[PDB]
Structure formats: structure tokens, C-alpha cells
Amino acid sequence: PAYTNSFTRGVYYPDKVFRSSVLHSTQDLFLPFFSNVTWFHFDNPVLPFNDGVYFASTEKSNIIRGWIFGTTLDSKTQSLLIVNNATNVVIKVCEFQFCNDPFLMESEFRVYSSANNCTFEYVSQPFLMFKNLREFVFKNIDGYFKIYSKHTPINLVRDLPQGFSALEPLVDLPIGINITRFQTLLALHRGAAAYYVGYLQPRTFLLKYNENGTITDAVDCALDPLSETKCTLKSFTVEKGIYQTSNFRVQPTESIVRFPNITNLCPFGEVFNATRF
Amino acid sequence: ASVYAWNRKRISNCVADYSVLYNSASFSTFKCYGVSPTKLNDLCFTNVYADSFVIRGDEVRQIAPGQTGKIADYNYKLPDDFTGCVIAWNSNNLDSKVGGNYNYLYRLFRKSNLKPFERDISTEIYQAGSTPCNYFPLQSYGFQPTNGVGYQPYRVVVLSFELLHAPATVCGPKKSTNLVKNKCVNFNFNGLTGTGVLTESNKKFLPFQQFGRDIADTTDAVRDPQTLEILDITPCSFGGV
Amino acid sequence: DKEWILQKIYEIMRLLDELXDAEASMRVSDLIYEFMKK
Amino acid sequence: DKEWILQKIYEIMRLLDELXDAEASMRVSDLIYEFMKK
Ligand SMILES: *[C@@H]1O[C@H](CO)[C@@H](O)[C@H](O)[C@H]1NC(C)=O
Ligand SMILES: *[C@@H]1O[C@H](CO)[C@@H](O)[C@H](O)[C@H]1NC(C)=O
Ligand SMILES: *[C@@H]1O[C@H](CO)[C@@H](O)[C@H](O)[C@H]1NC(C)=O
Ligand SMILES: *[C@@H]1O[C@H](CO)[C@@H](O)[C@H](O)[C@H]1NC(C)=O
Ligand SMILES: *[C@@H]1O[C@H](CO)[C@@H](O)[C@H](O)[C@H]1NC(C)=O
Ligand SMILES: *[C@@H]1O[C@H](CO)[C@@H](O)[C@H](O)[C@H]1NC(C)=O
């Protein structure tokens, strides 16, 4: 199915606050380190959003120039689309329909089904036109729309890298519309690229800030016990010893119920099966 | 956009000054409900749809919830529980022509009442009965620049202040007050507040960090909203004698 | 009964519109409105 | 209604009296005499 492991990419500053060279835990939405992600180049079908996503690219290409989201993905419920045209970006609440192939040397806006009944535009400056990589994630909370990004170098043509980076907000958007699925933004050229998608969960993380205030790297504490302890002692240096960390309950299975033997009585139907009235 | 050419046109994701309008006195018949005028310049929402039409100076005195001059009985009607404002003034300066501006016809009288927010937009030739007199009693305005007092084609606007479950209360800023240093103050930034002396701040932020805390969640480093510069906080001299 | 008289009053004020008063016909229209609602 | 409609339509005939047009003023007053007859 063209799976691949999600090694260490996938953090994002959980909030617009600063701290100075401290440890700091937090519960929010992330992806599990060493989890699976899918990719492709023939064609990329729709994927369901489902509570926060995380996206990446290949190198030596730009054919993919955005994303589109929603729930019913038609003119019924307001939708959205994100692309740029090399000098000024566009963001819509516009009602374009998911074609058999919503896509675009250039076939501009060939995705366009119908520009009808659109309520909010947005124009601004760009993020990106053996090259960089695309490190973006999206989430919808408190009736909001979010964004987190960065622009980082990349090599090793084959597949994802190792190493670890921070992420950055672009700008928050008070759209509020509903989304439950989405679809890549690809095109046909009349080519071989890599999109990457993984889901999110509510796991609690342990974040270390450098001298200046940049997130060097953190550690999730559900992977294995070694990690777990590290978040119940508040450091990266477990001194020799022993620590109980947490507990566990082996749950039940089926919740049987028992009650008296026969439990069938009280002549009721012969009154309705009666003769006359 | 005249009174049978109403357009619920859109205003959102934008902060519009409203109090500069009062001291401007560009309108002349300020009256509204649902909010104190001097308070709307402080709180408001999305859904700022408006209208701008032409009205004979007479009927204005009744533009209201439930009450409305029966001229706009069809042309434009309002309900109660209307959270917004309705302001108006004169337009007989240019919006009037010799011989009368018949360019606009105003609707007259229907077999049935109208309820607010919905109208009847198509040509009306009054029917004396099932069929009309089988001619036209439909009427159009006339506005000579020398018209009377109660018949100045007035200038009129209606404002909408409601909120769906969407975001974006897009309302007036706080004019901005000049900061102070080297004196303990009950400072209050954009929602954040506390006390203390603001002073220099060597600590070097990054371009996306509103404010700062060090450990135990003590608030100690704020980027000023004005110039992105960085400010320090310190609960100042206190204790026990 | 019907609005025949009303229609003729409209015709009167419109002939005055064709005359060139651009105020009198307006008054007449206002009062026609008043009778229709009355 | 009769008093008010009559008062107002007589005001109309008075106005169109002031603005010279005898035939239309007299026609509106003939409808008022119709109110007298109807
Ligand atoms: C990830 O995918 C590989 C194959 O691509 C599979 O062997 C493994 O069980 C998967 N694990 C998870 C957690 O998805
Ligand atoms: C536009 O979409 C909105 C959805 O809120 C709907 O209420 C409205 O009737 C639509 N109008 C047109 C002209 O499509
Ligand atoms: C749509 O939005 C409403 C609230 O805005 C929410 O209750 C609902 O779960 C969302 N999704 C669908 C599929 O309706
Ligand atoms: C911290 O910031 C200073 C000045 O901005 C810079 O010189 C230094 O390189 C930064 N720290 C690291 C580890 O890069
Ligand atoms: C009632 O209990 C007896 C006990 O042996 C059992 O044999 C019988 O099947 C029970 N009846 C029902 C209806 O369960
Ligand atoms: C009447 O008797 C039939 C069987 O002859 C039974 O299936 C039905 O349940 C009885 N009527 C009612 C109302 O239960």
C-alpha cells in the first residue's frame, strides 16, 4: 500500500509562548514516533482528514501546489482550496467540486468546477514555488483552522531523512467550516512525486528548549518504558536506579447478566385475541 | 441600492471605525437598538451585512422593528430582536432631478402582508381584483431639487450585528495607549495582565512568540504589540515589615 | 369597490408629472398611498 | 375613514387648485362629490 515509517518529523510549537532553556511537558495532538505514513507518485486519491494531519513532499518538483479539505466536498457545505500562482497566494471558502481529477506546462485552475457562492478570499505572499522539503501540518480545533510549516534542505533522493527539526506557524485562519476528508493537489503533464500523510492523536510530550528558545527535540512517552520514565522524572538523564512509573488495568470482556429462570407470565394477548367487545 | 433593490452585501474579517462617524455628523438621524452606540465601537461580531437605498424623506421617521411606513411595507421591513443599527440622513443634494426622478418605482399594496427579510421583487401593476382593470396604477418617485421638507430623498443605511458559530469578532481596536517603564503599574496587554516594572529585555525572541514564561509558569517576557520589541515584567517591591 | 378611481387619480398626478411640477404629483401619490392603506 | 379620506382628498384638490389645472382639480372634486353620492 506504499507505507513508510514516520521517524522523527512531526512536531510543532504547541503554542505561541516562549520559554528559556527549560523542560516543559504538554498534552496536545502529535504523531507517534516510528509510525506509518503512505505515499505514491500514478495518482493520489482522497484521504480522510480525521482530526489533524501531517504532510511532506519529494524533491526536484513542484507539481503539487496545495491541498483541499471539507466533509461532503461539494456545493452543499462550504469548502476550501490553497494554491499560489508564483506571485500572490490565494485562499478561498469557494465552492469548487471534487472532479474525477481535481488538478492543474500550465493548465491554470483546471480544477475549477464552479466559483459560485464563495464568501471569503485571502491573498498574500508565498512559501515555496536536490532541493528543499515540505514540512507542514494541519489541524482544526475550537472552530479554527491552523497551519504549521518550515522550509528545510533535503538530499538522499530515495525517501525520508533522519535528523530532527522544529516547525513554525504560518498564520491562523478563523474559517470555521467543517472538514472530514481532503484530497491531494496534483496534476497531469501533457510527474513522479511523493506526498506523505499520517494521522494524529492526543499524546503527551516532553519538550526541551535550547539556550535561545528553539525546540531542539522532544521525546514522546508512550513508545517504550525508557521513554516513559523520562517524562516522569522531568529530564533526559535517568540516574541509575528504579522508578515505578504508572499503573495498568486489565479490562473485562463481555459484562454477562443473569436473572431468574423463566420470567414469562401475565396473560396479555388473549385479551387482544378475545372474541367480542 | 434602492429600496426594492436591496442587497445584503457582505462585510466581515475587517475592523470598521464607527465612533468617528458620530463626531463626523455625516448621518443626521442616528437611532438604533440592540446595543448602546458608544459600546458597539467596542464589541461586535461577523455578519455585518448592510443596505444603502433611496427613500422619500417622509417615511424615514418610522423605519423600525415592526413599525415601518407602509411605503416600505413591501420595499423593506425589519423584525424585532434585531441586533444592529439603522442610521440615515439627507440626499436631495444630487439624488433628485428636474421633472422628478421617475427612475425609481416604489411598490404600493399587496393582497397580503410582508414579514421581514423577505420581499417581492418583480414588476407590480396593481390589480383591482383577480385581474387588473381590464392599465397601471404602479407609482414611481419624483424628486425635483426644489422638493419639500418631508420629501427629500433621504440617505439611509442599515447595519447587522449578529454571530453564527463561526469565528471573528471583528471590532474596533483600543486606540493604543503610550507605554511606561521604571514604575510599577497595573499593566494590561492584549488580554494578558499582571503588575510590575517593565524594563529592558536582552532575551532575544523569535518572530512568532507572543509572550514568555520561564518556569513554574511565571510571566516574565512580553513582546510589545506595538513594535515587536521585548519587555520585561517583575513583581516589584513587596513583603513584610 | 375596485381601485378604478384610484387609477384615475394616478392618471391625474401623472398628467401633472407630464406638466412639470415634480412635487404636486408626489403629494398626490402620497395621498393615494394613504387611501390604499386606509 | 370617511372624514379623514375626505379631508385629505379635499387637501389634494386644494393643492392642485393652487397649481393651475382646473380640469384635474375639478375631476378629483367630482370624485369627492361621488363620495357624497357614494
Ligand atoms: C507499518 O507498515 C508496515 C509495512 O509497511 C507493517 O509491517 C507494520 O505493521 C505497520 N505498523 C503500523 C504501526 O502501522
Ligand atoms: C449560498 O450558500 C449558503 C450556505 O450558507 C446558502 O444559505 C445560500 O442559499 C446559497 N445561495 C446561493 C445563491 O447559492
Ligand atoms: C459540522 O459542524 C458542526 C458545528 O459547526 C458540528 O457539530 C458537526 O459535527 C460538524 N460535522 C458534520 C459532519 O456535521
Ligand atoms: C543563539 O542566538 C545567538 C544570537 O542570536 C546566535 O549567535 C547563536 O548561534 C544562537 N545559538 C545557537 C546554538 O545557534
Ligand atoms: C430452571 O432451572 C433448572 C435447574 O436445573 C434448569 O434445568 C432449567 O433449564 C431452568 N429453566 C430455564 C427456562 O432456564
Ligand atoms: C393471538 O394468538 C396468536 C397465536 O394464535 C399469537 O401469535 C398472538 O401473539 C396472539 N395475540 C397477541 C396480541 O399477542
Author numbering:
A (entry chain C): 26 to 66, 79 to 141, 153 to 177, 186 to 246, 261 to 347
B (entry chain A): 348 to 481, 489 to 595
C (entry chain D), D (entry chain E): 1 to 38
From the manuscript:
Here, we demonstrate a strategy for designing dimeric helix-hairpin motifs from a previously reported three-helix-bundle miniprotein that targets the receptor-binding domain (RBD) of severe acute respiratory syndrome-coronavirus-2 (SARS-CoV-2). Through truncation of the third helix and optimization of the interhelical loop residues of the miniprotein, we developed a thermostable dimeric helix-hairpin.
The three-dimensional (3D) classification indicated that most particles adopt a dimeric state. The structure solved to a global 5.4 Å resolution at 0.143 Fourier shell correlation, showed a dimeric spike protein ectodomain trimer with all three RBDs from either spike protein oriented ‘up’ in an open conformation and attached head-to-head. To identify the interacting residues between SIH-5 and spike protein, we improved the resolution of the single spike protein trimer bound to SIH-5, which was solved at a resolution range of 3.5–4.5 Å using a local resolution calculation and a global resolution of 4.47 Å at 0.143 Fourier shell correlation. The side chains of the S2 region in spike protein are visible in high-resolution maps, which allowed us to calculate the atomic model from the cryo-EM map. The total interacting surface area of SIH-5 with RBD is 944 Å2. However, at this resolution, we could identify only a few interacting partners.
